[PDB]
């Protein structure tokens, strides 16, 4: 049963949430290969675990930049949550640790590359292709929300394709365990729900709105609200008018009018029937959820894998020396990491 699985899932999560794993590896157990991606206060690198020969992806966050951009609390959220969760489509945290300069999170290496890269290159995905990914995001948000977690940073930039062509969700930087409502103005301009922009309080429904932006971008090739300047993007999100490409199917557009819904009383995911309003939507009719969860379904796209440690699915980034200061920076701020 789903309730049964989730109840067992919750009991597993809670024991880890209350008793977080900490300091389970050290920088020197890993050989650094290549920068796979960057962010405002850090970067992610392909690494190899010396003792087993396994490959992993290591996220390195600069503590001082986290503080300058006031992201201390957000970062503690990310690790605490990530180590407690366990789902087929979540990038697994294999180990975490910190040093004088940085925080470290060592995740499974997902060799297929970012959805973003494939999306911009190909232009757009077919609907059955976009659906296969969307279904996985749907199950993942069901899992996540059942734990009282809000995700808040969905975008193609934050989704990876695995070796059998299934999706893996990454970046828990804005994720938060919250039962009530919250106020932080955060996320990516194109993906912000209107309630975030207008400084109202908000909840898990912002994730379902973001899913709507994602599905639209995957199927259209561009986002529903864009302009040269964020101020102008907000003016567009807030006005709420949305236009769809002519090739979007009816089921798709309907699904999106409901996810991209400014009225919180009407947004899909946020109603009485919860996520089932989405799983049972016509656009997903051909989707077998159990088979999807069991990974028994054939993926629409199997990435080219030219061997272990291959990185040809990621862009090249300027390599910077990973410098670790001789002084502890911001020790008190990150004590529990």
């Amino acid at each position: 049963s789903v309730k049964e699985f989730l109840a067992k899932a919750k009991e597993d999560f809670l024991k880890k949430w209350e008793s977080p794993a900490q300091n389970t590896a050290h920088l020197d157990q890993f050989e650094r290969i290549k920068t796979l991606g960057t962010g405002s206060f850090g970067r992610v690198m392909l690494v190899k675990h010396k003792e087993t020969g396994n490959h992993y992806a290591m996220k390195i966050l600069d503590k001082q930049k986290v503080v300058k951009l006031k992201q201390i609390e957000h970062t503690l959220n990310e690790k605490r949550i990530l180590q407690a969760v366990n789902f087929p489509f979540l990038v697994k945290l294999e180990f975490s640790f910190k040093d004088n300069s940085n925080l470290y999170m060592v995740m499974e290496y997902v060799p297929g590359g970012e959805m973003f890269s494939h999306l911009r290159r190909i232009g757009r995905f077919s609907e059955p292709h976009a659906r296969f990914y969307a279904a996985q995001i749907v199950l993942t948000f069901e899992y996540l929300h059942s734990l009282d977690l809000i995700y808040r940073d969905l975008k193609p930039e934050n989704l990876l394709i695995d070796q059998q062509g299934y999706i893996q969700v990454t970046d828990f930087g804005f994720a938060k365990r919250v039962k009530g409502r919250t106020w932080t103005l955060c996320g990516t301009p194109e993906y912000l729900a209107p309630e975030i922009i207008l400084s109202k309080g908000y909840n898990k429904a912002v994730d379902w709105w973001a899913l709507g932006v994602l599905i639209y971008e995957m199927a259209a090739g561009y986002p529903p609200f864009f302009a040269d300047q964020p101020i102008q993007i907000y003016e567009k999100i807030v006005s709420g008018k949305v236009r769809f490409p002519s090739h979007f199917s009816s089921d798709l557009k309907d699904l999106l009018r409901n996810l991209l819904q400014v009225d919180l009383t009407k947004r899909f995911g946020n109603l009485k029937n919860g996520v089932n309003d989405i799983k049972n939507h016509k656009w997903f009719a051909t989707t077998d959820w159990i088979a999807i969860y069991q990974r028994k379904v054939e993926a629409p796209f199997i990435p080219k894998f030219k061997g272990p440690g291959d990185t040809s699915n990621f862009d090249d980034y300027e390599e910077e020396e990973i410098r670790v200061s001789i002084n502890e920076k911001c020790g008190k701020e990150f004590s529990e990491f």
Binding site: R120, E157, F174, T188, P189, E190, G221, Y222, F226, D228
Partner: peptide, 18 residues
């Protein structure tokens, strides 16, 4: 076309969080 407007816009690269 909207695709042409997007592609010619300054926001087709990776977008940063605010």
């Amino acid at each position: 076309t909207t695709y042409a407007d997007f592609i010619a816009s300054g926001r087709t690269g990776r977008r940063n969080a605010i």
